Structure 1
């Protein structure tokens, strides 16, 4: 923001924000997959109990 003027800083911040949002989406998707796996594991554990 300090070293670039608003026009180009806009697209630079848009690049950064797209990257970070995609990274967070990937993290949450992997977390959902792991949560489904752990749900299956917990169901098996309850059946065993």
Structure 2
């Protein structure tokens, strides 16, 4: 669960505060939504296990 947090779920980088200083807000919306969806799926799998 810890190692899955640093995973690029289709985004530019898996670290916050990095895609907000090099991209536009409208693109940052999707760049954050992808990571949010990936982390939610990982946490749901963890909760099921």
Quickly name the TM-score band, shorter chain normalised: 0.5 to 0.7
Give the TM-score taking structure 2 as reference length. Answer: 0.59
Q: Structure 1, unaligned stretches of length 5 or more?
A: 31-49
Aligned CA-pair RMSD: 0.5
Structure ranking higher in helix proportion: 1
Give the TM-score taking structure 1 as reference length. Answer: 0.59
Q: Structure 2, unaligned stretches of length 5 or more?
A: 1-19
Q: How many residues were matched structurally?
A: 30
Greater RCO between the two (CA within 8 Å, min separation 6)? 2
Larger Rg: 1
